Amino acid sequence: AVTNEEIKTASKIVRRVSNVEAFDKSGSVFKGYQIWTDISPTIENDPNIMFVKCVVQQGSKKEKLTVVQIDPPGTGTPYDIDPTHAWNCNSQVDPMSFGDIGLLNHTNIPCVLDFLKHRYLKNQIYTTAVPLIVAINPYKDLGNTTNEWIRRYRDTADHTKLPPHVFTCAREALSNLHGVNKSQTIIVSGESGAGKTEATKQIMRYFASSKSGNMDLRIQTAIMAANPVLEAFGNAKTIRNNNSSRFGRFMQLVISHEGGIRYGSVVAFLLEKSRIITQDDNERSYHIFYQFLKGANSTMKSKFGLKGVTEYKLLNPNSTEVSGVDDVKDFEEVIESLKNMELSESDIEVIFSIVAGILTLGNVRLIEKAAAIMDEDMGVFNKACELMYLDPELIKREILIKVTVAGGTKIEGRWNKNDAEVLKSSLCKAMYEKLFLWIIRHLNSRIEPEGGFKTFMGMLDIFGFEVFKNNSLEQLFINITNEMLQKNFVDIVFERESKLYKDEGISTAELKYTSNKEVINVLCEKGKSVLSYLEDQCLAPGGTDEKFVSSCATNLKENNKFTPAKVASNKNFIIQHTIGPIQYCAESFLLKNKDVLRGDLVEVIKDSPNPIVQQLFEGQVIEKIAKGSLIGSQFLNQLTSLMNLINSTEPHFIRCIKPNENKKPLEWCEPKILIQLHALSILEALVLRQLGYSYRRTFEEFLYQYKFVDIAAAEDSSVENQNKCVNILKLSGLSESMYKIGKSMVFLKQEGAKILTKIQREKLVEWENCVSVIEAAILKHKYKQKVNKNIPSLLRVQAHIRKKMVAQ
Amino acid sequence: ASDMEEKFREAFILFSSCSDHIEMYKFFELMNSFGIILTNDEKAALPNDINMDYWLNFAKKHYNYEQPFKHINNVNEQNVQIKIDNFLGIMKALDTRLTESDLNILLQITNPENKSTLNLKTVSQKLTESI
Amino acid sequence: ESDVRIYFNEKSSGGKISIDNASYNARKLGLAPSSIDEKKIKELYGDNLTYEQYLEYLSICVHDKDNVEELIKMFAHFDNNCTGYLTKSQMKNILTTWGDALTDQEAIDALNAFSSEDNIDYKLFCEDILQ
Ligand SMILES: Nc1ncnc2c1ncn2[C@@H]1O[C@H](COP(=O)(O)OP(=O)(O)O)[C@@H](O)[C@H]1O
Ligand SMILES: [Mg+2]
């Protein structure tokens, strides 16, 4: 499962920032001094392990350390590591005692990974790196998202006494909305299988839980019913996920302060059309196909003339079954959900007639006569069109008759087998995508507010940055979205910090901002971008994929953000994305961008006697291709609208992690988790929060915490709290650069706060023995209490051992 | 006669996660749980891979049977009372592993009342009872 | 049902069975009694049971609630890295320190009978003894 490309990437993410203090004043190793190292036979032999715990041996030199691995258990063998391969350890720390990664003394990569690991192993899958919430997929039901948990997270007096959870984010977002009359957006991001759709569904169920009723239950049920429907039509079983979302989703919700969804709006964008036609081995198409064919009753099967799951060219005959997926039971849920979306039994029959029609059309065989439909399949063709409420003669004419414009005259001709197969495929894909969008459009007409949203709760459930072996146009669109989301993240972190300093009268010139404006421009900017050049090449008469790549290298020399490829320089390009360089393959890019149904076929569909079929392409406009018709052109339009809307809201960020590629609980692959920590800006979030005046506590908070730095200045009745703090700070030994006194708070640099903790500790040296003995005596009591809870279980083991003894 | 062996054995395995060997940092916690305090020079002279038997001998030689928790309070001196928030301040300043729960438990035990100060003779008495 | 009377008659003295012989009969009968079940029937009828009290005792010794999930709790508690394994020494220390503690020979034997290796899959050990 672990690639060498993952090992190369993971090792590039590791950095040694914190220098290890293994020696005393005398130059002697601190007895038992623990470090993290990336040098071990355990690491060579186990691709899952990236770091091991070692103790620095008595006799080490500062230039080269002699260490012995202790965790995982080793040989007891001393070996030598260079200090650039030793990292600080958070020894004697409970990972369950606090929720933020940043409250750790050491936040180096082996330290972050260990904290997350030990929490994950105790079924604490949520951890913050403010403002981000990290959610690691447990690949099992932990039972932490039940109604008892919703009521607990919702009705608890002091919100800060609850551990991190997706419900904490749902609660904070809903409090701010109603508290300061401001719209919010919960952004759920991660890779396929990370747990995004689950986190989304969990948050919606939290929102749908009202303390004392919802009179708008009819709207809430329609919205909640969208989950099974959107999944059936837009999710598929891939190799990396049995229920993969193959679209981007955005929702706006109107939720009462007590819980209860009153209004909503759903948006589904970038649906993977190619899946409708072909699927890789061990991969299915959209669940709906299998749910429908397997679950449809005898009457429905005879009406639509349905054949089996293994009997359709559009469906892989070998990946029909999925482990723990009952398509029949899921179909019953889908029918009920469609009914709850206020669709009539007539509407539902049209929905499945079109699905049956798309499937039937895929079975029609074409031959070379110029192309022609096989006579054997002429009835199969007619049934397909009747099922899709389309004109059989007019649909036939659009698949087999070609209208070329030579000179300035229209010339009737014929499509060859290959060209006609493309048109038939395009019709299948277009009919499906527009039906999927119509179901959403219909839902929105039942759930949306008549005059638009005043204040809403936004929700984005989107694929994070994608870095595959072959990165195509879909990866380019995903990575462009994620660049806009990264700008949103760095912008809000800055805006929030800049306001705090300003409110307290601290200098905002010291603050740091890393813009991705350069890479946004190279990808989107009108006239000088990859997307602008993709459009020009698509609109050009002799436009090719190679001329697109060539025009990119020729006109994007001002920034390093565009870099031409080394191996096959043409047909390949590389972009300097925020998470590093991503290499795209421009092969089929123009074909992919132009993959939108042509003018004349659309007009036949609009001319259907069925009102639902007439609505699929409502006001599409007739047409070679125009700018606004290309996938990328429409994509950038939607993206700007979507981003303008989110930039108007207070953002919330849920970053999901897939801990292994095996879909197993309690299985931790460090190289894979590290690539994700990086890609999800979890590591950058720690960096950002640590910069500048990192520590901020009220005068009273500072005085309780740093009391014994100078107990005389702290316990002086005459001086004010603002003055006491300047007296403690001036006497301490801290440089003026390390601290600032604000209106209500003491502002400290991260380094200054650590020195001040160390000053206070020197002043209380006489307590060290007393505090050690009290703490250790309590820990011994605490450890025995954890044994006591498990003694009833042990009595059972012992009882069975003594029974097995008698048996002998 | 008052053998502490069975208690020294159980305490080692609570700190070693039932293995017959213990890490250096966890040996320090174990000895300290019995009031044993070592100097940095005594710490350095310890074996690098401490086993059960080494501890059982070390504890017999170092444990103060007459006065465990002499490092919280010595009966030979007198000067034994601190304000609750000052004690909690010191506990936190020296970076305790002890959580808010653990500390609150320790507080209602060693201070059954809500008296403005905590007595260290009462802390050492209560901790000795709990051995 | 037949074996229940057959085993009782083998250990029965003056129409009554002792608690140690009643527990031995339950072990012979494939039941796994503990000190808790032994203390329950002690609280009710003393150390010598009639045939009615002996049957009622075998009813307490039916622990249908027993499975791998339940029994593994103490071992799982000491498996900090969640490997699903513990060494023989870890498990011997658990089995001989707390609860109805076994002797060091009894524990060593039970473990040595299960595996020849130092690292024991404790889920498989518990599954084996339940049989
Ligand atoms: N919080 C969770 N608890 C339990 N299982 C989960 C959780 N999140 C995800 N899963 C499991 O992982 C699978 C993939 O998660 P999913 O929400 O679809 O991720 P994504 O949308 O990022 O691809 C789920 O279908 C489910 O089996
Ligand atoms: Mg999803």
Side-chain angles (χ1 to χ4, degrees):
Chain A
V2 198
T3 314
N4 268 274
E5 191 54 54
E6 290 181 309
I7 299 289
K8 164 260 167 198
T9 305
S11 66
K12 281 178 183 293
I13 314 311
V14 307
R15 271 164 292 273
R16 210 270 194 160
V17 197
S18 326
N19 189 201
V20 163
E21 331 84 336
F23 315 87
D24 58 22
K25 317 143 180 165
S26 328
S28 263
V29 178
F30 292 120
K31 194 72 164 182
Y33 195 83
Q34 305 181 344
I35 54 99
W36 287 110
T37 193
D38 63 323
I39 291 163
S40 163
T42 308
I43 295 165
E44 314 182 323
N45 301 336
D46 200 348
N48 277 358
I49 297 151
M50 260 196 103
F51 298 98
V52 303
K53 222 200 262 81
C54 291
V55 344
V56 186
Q57 297 304 110
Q58 299 297 106
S60 291
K61 186 52 195 70
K62 330 227 170 169
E63 74 217 18
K64 203 98 169 186
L65 303 178
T66 298
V67 293
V68 167
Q69 175 183 325
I70 64 155
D71 199 32
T75 51
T77 314
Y79 67 110
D80 317 305
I81 64 148
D82 188 81
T84 59
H85 280 94
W87 288 267
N88 269 302
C89 217
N90 295 128
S91 301
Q92 319 166 340
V93 159
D94 188 6
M96 308 285 286
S97 58
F98 52 88
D100 202 271
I101 305 170
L103 293 174
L104 240 37
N105 185 23
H106 303 290
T107 64
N108 54 60
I109 282 135
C111 281
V112 174
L113 279 174
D114 193 74
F115 180 67
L116 295 175
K117 189 196 173 192
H118 279 287
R119 281 167 72 78
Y120 172 73
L121 296 174
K122 290 232 225 291
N123 296 319
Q124 187 45 234
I125 65 144
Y126 317 104
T127 312
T128 69
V130 290
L132 315 184
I133 301 112
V134 188
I136 306 173
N137 193 343
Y139 277 119
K140 82 179 166 295
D141 185 34
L142 305 174
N144 58 353
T145 62
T146 61
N147 274 109
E148 188 197 52
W149 281 71
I150 290 148
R151 296 186 287 268
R152 191 92 193 93
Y153 271 78
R154 180 192 74 202
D155 309 322
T156 278
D158 184 41
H159 58 276
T160 51
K161 71 207 170 191
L162 290 150
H165 205 291
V166 291
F167 297 162
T168 296
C169 180
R171 190 185 167 165
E172 275 165 4
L174 198 58
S175 271
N176 305 331
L177 196 161
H178 291 289
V180 294
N181 312 148
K182 178 70 162 164
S183 288
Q184 317 274 135
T185 307
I186 296 170
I187 306 140
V188 187
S189 218
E191 72 179 33
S192 185
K196 295 191 255 75
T197 298
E198 288 308 306
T200 297
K201 297 202 272 167
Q202 281 154 13
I203 293 162
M204 278 173 87
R205 299 192 307 246
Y206 176 93
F207 290 156
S209 295
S210 54
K211 285 171 189 267
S212 41
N214 183 357
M215 290 301 284
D216 284 298
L217 184 58
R218 181 209 117 239
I219 295 166
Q220 189 181 270
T221 304
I223 291 166
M224 291 295 114
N227 299 330
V229 178
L230 260 38
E231 284 184 21
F233 283 92
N235 289 28
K237 177 249 174 176
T238 76
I239 42 152
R240 287 167 216 81
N241 195 0
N242 284 353
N243 190 27
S244 183
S245 277
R246 312 264 106 205
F247 67 105
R249 167 214 195 138
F250 182 77
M251 299 179 291
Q252 281 177 283
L253 303 165
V254 173
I255 310 133
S256 305
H257 73 282
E258 308 228 275
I261 310 173
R262 323 303 298 221
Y263 295 116
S265 190
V266 183
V267 176
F269 51 93
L270 305 174
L271 180 82
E272 185 173 87
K273 272 192 268 67
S274 76
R275 192 158 289 256
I276 310 150
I277 300 311
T278 341
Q279 309 89 46
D280 304 343
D281 304 296
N282 332 294
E283 277 207 356
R284 296 160 129 201
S285 190
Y286 298 117
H287 301 125
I288 202 51
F289 292 122
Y290 309 88
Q291 284 174 6
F292 178 45
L293 294 178
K294 293 193 205 172
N297 62 50
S298 309
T299 287
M300 187 173 230
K301 282 187 161 83
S302 44
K303 233 182 147 59
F304 304 136
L306 304 175
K307 303 287 161 261
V309 276
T310 60
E311 287 167 65
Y312 289 96
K313 281 169 189 265
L314 292 194
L315 311 176
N316 182 341
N318 312 118
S319 62
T320 271
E321 282 289 330
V322 187
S323 64
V325 171
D326 190 342
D327 305 283
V328 168
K329 162 121 183 164
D330 294 337
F331 187 63
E332 303 166 9
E333 191 194 344
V334 163
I335 301 298
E336 269 305 313
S337 298
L338 287 168
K339 285 173 177 168
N340 295 348
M341 280 176 53
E342 307 190 284
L343 280 155
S344 56
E345 285 211 296
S346 127
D347 286 346
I348 294 164
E349 276 192 59
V350 178
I351 291 152
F352 293 108
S353 195
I354 298 150
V355 178
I358 289 148
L359 277 174
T360 304
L361 194 70
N363 274 12
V364 181
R365 289 160 303 164
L366 298 163
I367 41 166
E368 248 161 342
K369 211 173 198 166
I373 296 156
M374 270 182 79
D375 309 61
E376 296 93 316
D377 292 9
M378 200 56 218
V380 180
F381 178 86
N382 296 343
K383 189 60 164 158
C385 298
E386 286 152 18
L387 285 168
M388 290 186 281
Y389 308 91
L390 298 176
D391 193 298
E393 287 63 52
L394 298 180
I395 290 296
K396 194 184 163 183
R397 284 198 123 252
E398 294 306 319
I399 290 155
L400 313 171
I401 295 128
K402 178 186 192 162
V403 179
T404 326
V405 53
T409 321
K410 280 173 172 184
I411 286 128
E412 193 163 299
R414 288 201 136 267
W415 292 109
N416 50 83
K417 190 209 146 85
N418 312 92
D419 287 346
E421 291 280 355
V422 175
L423 286 157
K424 195 185 88 221
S425 277
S426 292
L427 186 51
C428 284
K429 290 191 267 136
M431 278 304 284
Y432 191 84
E433 193 195 63
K434 296 285 178 284
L435 168 70
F436 178 62
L437 298 172
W438 182 83
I439 299 165
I440 297 163
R441 250 181 293 130
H442 175 86
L443 165 67
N444 288 341
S445 76
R446 308 306 293 134
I447 62 161
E448 276 179 359
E450 250 192 353
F453 295 97
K454 170 155 188 207
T455 303
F456 69 93
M457 176 76 64
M459 293 202 68
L460 186 63
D461 175 6
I462 201 92
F463 348 62
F465 277 112
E466 277 184 347
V467 196
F468 283 88
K469 275 269 152 281
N470 192 74
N471 291 303
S472 197
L473 201 59
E474 323 81 58
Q475 282 67 50
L476 181 69
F477 293 162
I478 286 162
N479 294 345
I480 283 160
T481 304
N482 281 280
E483 278 304 340
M484 303 301 219
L485 295 179
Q486 176 65 20
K487 197 227 193 290
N488 182 283
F489 166 72
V490 294
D491 278 348
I492 213 73
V493 167
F494 186 97
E495 278 174 48
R496 285 168 178 161
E497 199 66 0
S498 200
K499 169 75 169 163
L500 178 62
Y501 280 35
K502 282 167 201 157
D503 275 19
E504 229 74 12
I506 289 102
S507 192
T508 48
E510 198 254 4
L511 295 164
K512 317 290 173 195
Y513 183 80
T514 308
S515 78
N516 59 330
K517 156 226 89 173
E518 268 178 62
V519 72
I520 304 276
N521 285 358
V522 81
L523 292 166
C524 314
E525 188 181 28
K526 179 59 202 159
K528 278 198 287 172
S529 69
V530 180
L531 288 181
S532 212
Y533 300 134
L534 169 71
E535 183 178 65
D536 294 351
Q537 282 288 129
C538 277
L539 296 172
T544 175
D545 291 354
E546 198 222 74
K547 269 175 180 184
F548 155 74
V549 191
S550 194
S551 63
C552 275
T554 305
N555 314 314
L556 305 151
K557 292 175 190 171
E558 48 259 275
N559 44 15
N560 195 41
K561 304 297 148 178
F562 186 92
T563 323
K566 278 200 252 180
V567 210
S569 202
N570 60 333
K571 196 199 94 280
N572 278 71
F573 69 101
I574 175 145
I575 308 282
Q576 296 304 322
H577 279 103
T578 293
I579 60 116
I582 306 163
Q583 190 194 287
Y584 299 98
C585 178
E587 179 69 8
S588 309
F589 257 47
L590 262 76
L591 204 77
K592 288 188 166 194
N593 206 48
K594 284 186 227 171
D595 188 25
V596 61
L597 213 75
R598 297 102 222 143
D600 245 16
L601 246 164
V602 171
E603 294 309 300
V604 181
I605 307 161
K606 287 167 99 156
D607 261 276
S608 167
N610 179 277
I612 288 165
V613 185
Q614 281 176 344
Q615 280 170 70
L616 308 180
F617 294 85
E618 230 172 348
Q620 207 75 4
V621 189
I622 340 152
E623 69 180 335
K624 193 58 174 169
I625 31 76
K627 41 170 191 163
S629 148
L630 301 156
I631 298 181
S633 312
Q634 295 180 64
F635 161 76
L636 197 57
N637 284 359
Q638 292 157 49
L639 183 69
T640 313
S641 306
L642 170 67
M643 286 301 119
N644 281 170
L645 190 62
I646 293 174
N647 295 324
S648 289
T649 75
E650 203 63 50
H652 291 73
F653 324 92
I654 308 165
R655 304 284 160 116
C656 303
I657 295 181
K658 187 168 105 205
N660 67 81
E661 227 100 329
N662 291 116
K663 313 183 188 103
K664 294 199 231 159
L666 307 168
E667 183 174 309
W668 194 260
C669 184
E670 294 166 33
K672 291 179 202 233
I673 296 159
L674 182 59
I675 291 166
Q676 293 178 256
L677 286 173
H678 174 71
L680 296 161
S681 293
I682 292 157
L683 304 182
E684 192 208 1
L686 295 169
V687 164
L688 288 182
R689 186 72 186 84
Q690 288 168 336
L691 296 199
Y693 295 100
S694 169
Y695 173 109
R696 300 90 55 141
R697 297 270 286 272
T698 61
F699 302 126
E700 43 184 355
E701 274 171 350
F702 179 86
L703 269 151
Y704 170 82
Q705 192 187 341
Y706 293 112
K707 209 178 180 276
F708 308 92
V709 168
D710 192 65
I711 194 73
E715 291 185 328
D716 184 7
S717 47
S718 61
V719 273
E720 300 233 313
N721 275 187
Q722 182 144 25
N723 308 150
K724 279 190 218 169
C725 296
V726 311
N727 295 343
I728 295 151
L729 292 161
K730 269 207 173 180
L731 263 141
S732 63
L734 283 189
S735 65
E736 279 63 33
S737 52
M738 278 165 187
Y739 67 93
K740 288 298 155 197
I741 280 87
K743 255 191 176 277
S744 82
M745 296 173 296
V746 174
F747 278 67
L748 289 174
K749 271 173 173 282
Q750 201 207 200
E751 197 187 18
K754 286 181 175 175
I755 290 153
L756 205 59
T757 290
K758 281 171 144 278
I759 289 159
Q760 201 180 29
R761 179 145 193 167
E762 293 168 328
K763 310 283 165 284
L764 302 164
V765 66
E766 292 172 314
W767 288 90
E768 241 141 66
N769 281 344
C770 183
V771 164
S772 286
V773 169
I774 292 162
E775 175 199 282
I778 296 302
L779 291 180
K780 188 177 83 226
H781 173 75
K782 179 168 174 181
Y783 297 159
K784 181 54 182 292
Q785 281 181 312
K786 296 177 200 292
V787 152
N788 284 347
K789 66 174 188 203
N790 299 295
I791 289 168
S793 148
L794 186 51
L795 296 191
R796 296 280 92 240
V797 175
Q798 290 161 339
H800 272 104
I801 293 176
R802 289 190 176 100
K803 146 257 218 188
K804 208 157 220 82
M805 271 167 184
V806 158
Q808 309 313 299
Chain B
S2 49
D3 176 92
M4 280 276 105
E5 203 218 78
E6 194 201 82
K7 287 236 163 252
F8 295 149
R9 288 201 175 269
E10 184 204 36
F12 183 99
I13 68 166
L14 281 169
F15 282 97
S16 74
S17 297
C18 295
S19 89
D20 300 314
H21 290 85
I22 201 176
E23 296 315 320
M24 196 54 72
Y25 285 180
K26 237 127 201 296
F27 177 73
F28 299 158
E29 279 170 50
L30 163 67
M31 68 178 199
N32 286 358
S33 71
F34 284 104
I36 311 149
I37 288 295
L38 293 181
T39 59
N40 302 294
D41 316 78
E42 287 173 306
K43 270 177 174 200
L46 284 164
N48 286 278
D49 181 23
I50 294 147
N51 89 131
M52 172 71 75
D53 295 349
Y54 179 86
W55 155 249
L56 293 183
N57 265 301
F58 168 107
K60 262 197 133 293
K61 292 160 102 186
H62 290 75
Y63 180 68
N64 196 345
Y65 293 86
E66 293 71 23
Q67 237 217 303
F69 305 114
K70 173 178 165 196
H71 295 292
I72 298 167
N73 171 262
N74 195 359
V75 156
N76 300 328
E77 276 134 52
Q78 197 95 344
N79 72 345
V80 58
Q81 223 161 10
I82 21 77
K83 293 161 264 183
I84 309 156
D85 246 18
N86 271 35
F87 173 78
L88 289 174
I90 305 148
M91 283 297 284
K92 291 166 198 180
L94 298 187
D95 196 26
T96 41
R97 288 200 57 167
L98 254 50
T99 72
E100 198 212 316
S101 59
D102 308 336
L103 281 160
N104 291 347
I105 288 154
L106 152 72
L107 276 178
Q108 56 188 28
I109 296 162
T110 65
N111 179 56
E113 312 78 50
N114 290 154
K115 294 178 182 180
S116 32
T117 60
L118 178 74
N119 203 295
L120 301 184
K121 285 235 172 192
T122 308
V123 170
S124 50
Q125 271 162 29
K126 287 290 161 285
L127 292 181
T128 42
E129 285 168 28
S130 308
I131 292 167
Chain C
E1 53 175 62
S2 274
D3 334 87
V4 169
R5 201 165 275 205
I6 299 158
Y7 304 149
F8 177 94
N9 293 317
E10 284 170 66
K11 326 286 156 184
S12 178
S13 187
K16 275 171 167 281
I17 199 159
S18 76
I19 287 183
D20 308 281
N21 281 325
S23 296
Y24 173 77
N25 281 5
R27 293 178 167 109
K28 234 183 181 164
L29 280 155
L31 297 169
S34 77
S35 70
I36 288 187
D37 311 315
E38 283 184 322
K39 286 157 202 160
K40 273 189 209 140
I41 214 73
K42 237 154 208 174
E43 256 178 282
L44 294 170
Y45 314 110
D47 204 60
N48 272 268
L49 312 166
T50 63
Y51 191 74
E52 160 80 44
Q53 301 157 352
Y54 157 84
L55 298 166
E56 192 188 329
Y57 178 57
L58 295 173
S59 170
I60 304 150
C61 294
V62 65
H63 292 281
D64 45 90
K65 330 104 191 69
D66 295 5
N67 53 31
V68 175
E69 278 174 5
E70 172 71 349
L71 271 68
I72 63 150
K73 281 174 165 201
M74 190 66 90
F75 300 127
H77 174 61
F78 285 110
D79 179 20
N80 306 113
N81 283 343
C82 285
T83 60
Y85 294 80
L86 247 48
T87 64
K88 260 162 170 187
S89 63
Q90 285 188 285
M91 292 185 95
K92 184 224 82 193
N93 288 332
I94 289 161
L95 295 170
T96 61
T97 306
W98 310 287
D100 301 341
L102 309 169
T103 69
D104 292 62
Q105 198 52 49
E106 278 179 329
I108 267 152
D109 287 346
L111 301 162
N112 279 349
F114 177 76
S115 171
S116 316
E117 292 137 316
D118 179 58
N119 305 282
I120 288 163
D121 182 317
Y122 58 78
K123 280 192 217 88
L124 288 176
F125 174 81
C126 293
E127 190 199 297
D128 185 78
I129 65 163
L130 277 164
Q131 282 167 19

